[PDB]
Amino acid sequence: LVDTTEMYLRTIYELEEEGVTPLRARIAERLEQSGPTVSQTVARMERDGLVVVASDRSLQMTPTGRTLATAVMRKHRLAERLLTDIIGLDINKVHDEACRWEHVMSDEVERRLVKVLKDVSRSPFGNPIPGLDELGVPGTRVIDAATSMPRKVRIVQINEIFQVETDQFTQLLDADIRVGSEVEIVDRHITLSHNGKDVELLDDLAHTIRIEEL
Ligand SMILES: [Zn+2]
Numbered sequence: 073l074v075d076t077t078e079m080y081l082r083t084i085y086e087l088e089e090e091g092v093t094p095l096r097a098r099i100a101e102r103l104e105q106s107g108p109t110v111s112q113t114v115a116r117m118e119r120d121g122l123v124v125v126a127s128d129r130s131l132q133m134t135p136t137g138r139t140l141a142t143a144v145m146r147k148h149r150l151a152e153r154l155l156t157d158i159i160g161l162d163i164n165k166v167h168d169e170a171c172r173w174e175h176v177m178s179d180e181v182e183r184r185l186v187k188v189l190k191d192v193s194r195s196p197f198g199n200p201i202p203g204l205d206e207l208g209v210p211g212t213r214v215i216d217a218a219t220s221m222p223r224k225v226r227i228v229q230i231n232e233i234f235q236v237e238t239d240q241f242t243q244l245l246d247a248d249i250r251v252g253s254e255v256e257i258v259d260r261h262i263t264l265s266h267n268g269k270d271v272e273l274l275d276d277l278a279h280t281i282r283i284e285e286l
Contacts, residue, residue, distance in 0.1 A: 073175060073176070074172070074175040074176070075175060076113060077113070077116075077117060077120070077122065077140075078140065078141075078144045078174070078175055079103060079175075080099065080103070080110075080113055080114070080117060080123075081117075081122065081123075081133065081137055081140055081141035081144060082141055082144040082145055082148065082174065083099050083102050083103055084099065084123070084131055084133055084137075084141060085133070085138075085141040085142065085144075085145050086102070086145075087099070087102065089199065093128075093130045094130050094131045094132075095129060095130050095131070096110050096111065096114060096125075096129065096131065099131065114131065117137070121134055121136060121137075122134055122136055122137030122140065123137050139203075139206070142202050142203040142206070143179075143203055143206070144174050144175070145174075145201075145202055145203070146182065146201060146202050146203035146204065146207060147173070147174045147175075147177040147182060148170045148171065148173070148174035148195075149170070149194075149195035149199065149201040149202075150177070150182050150185045150186070150189070150192065150201060151169070151170040151173040151174060151177055152166050152167065152170045152195045152196050152197070153185065153189050153191075153192060153195065153196065153201075154185055154189070155169055155170060155196075156196045157189060157190065158188075158189075163196065166196060167197065179207060182207055182209070183207065183208070183209055183285070186204070186207070186209040187209075192204065192209075208284055208285075210228045210229055210282055210284070211226075211228035211229065211282035211283050211284040212282060212283060212284075212285070213278070213279060213280065213281070213282055214257060214262055214264065214273065214277070214278045214279075214281045214282070214283055215262065215278045215279050217257055217283050217285070218257040218258050218259040218262045218264070218278075219257075219258065219259050220258070220259055220260070221258065222256050222257065222258035222265070223256060223257060223258070223286070224254055224255065224256045224257075224286050225254070225255060225256070225257050225283045225284070225285055225286045226252070226253070226254055226255075226283060226284040226285075226286055227249060227250065227251055227252060227253045227254075227255055227281065227282075227283055228251065228252075228282045228283055228284045229251055229281065229282045230244065230250065230251055230281055231280040231281060231282070234280055235276060235277070235280070236276065237274060237276055237277075240271070240273065240274065240277055243269075243271050244271060246267075246269060247265075247266050247267045247269035247270075247271050248266060248267040248269075249264065249266045249267070249271060253266060254266070254286065255283075257283065261273065261274075261278075262278045264281075264283075
């Protein structure tokens with residue numbers, strides 16, 4: 073989704089990167105949007121809790137806004153690597169194309185690109201590709217990762233230390249499902265199978281076990 077908000081956020085990120093103070097006017101200039109439009113948009117983002125306007129009037133991304141800004145720059149740069157490395161688009165066109173693709177590239181495509189690209193260190197233009205750690209290239213909660221259709225996946229964390237109920241502990245041990253294991257999930261209650269042993273989980277386990285997509 074080509075968010076106006078994702079464009080303001082990546083712009084702030086970009087200026088910061090250049091060592092420029094993210095003032096509203098520089099942002100207006102960079103986005104070729106009038107001062108009145110940027111105030112409008114910034115006022116909105118503030119309500120969304122994505123940016124605060126500092127004492128010196130500069131814009132400061134909140135942790136949630138920074139995270140989203142980083143995700144966008146990551147997508148932008150992965151798209152550029154894709155564009156030059158595989159597609160072979162004219163180098164002179166690459167940045168403008170990626171500016172559009174950054175809004176519609178999913179996290180899944182990005183994981184694939186980290187896999188097929190020979191190097192995701194920098195963009196073709198000399199800047200490091202950020203947010204790779206957060207892309208996961210800990211993990212998605214089983215509750216969010218399982219679906220009506222089973223699929224294998226990797227166990228990242230069992231989080232038993234956070235468990236109040238422990239009667240499922242030995243099931244996991246018997247089904248040889250530990251951290252770093254490749255099991256198969258599915259929504260139905262959620263049941264993660266492995267070692268030929270299906271393990272149906274209770275709310276608490278499903279809400280705390282994290283699995284990295286295979
Ligand atoms: Zn670019």
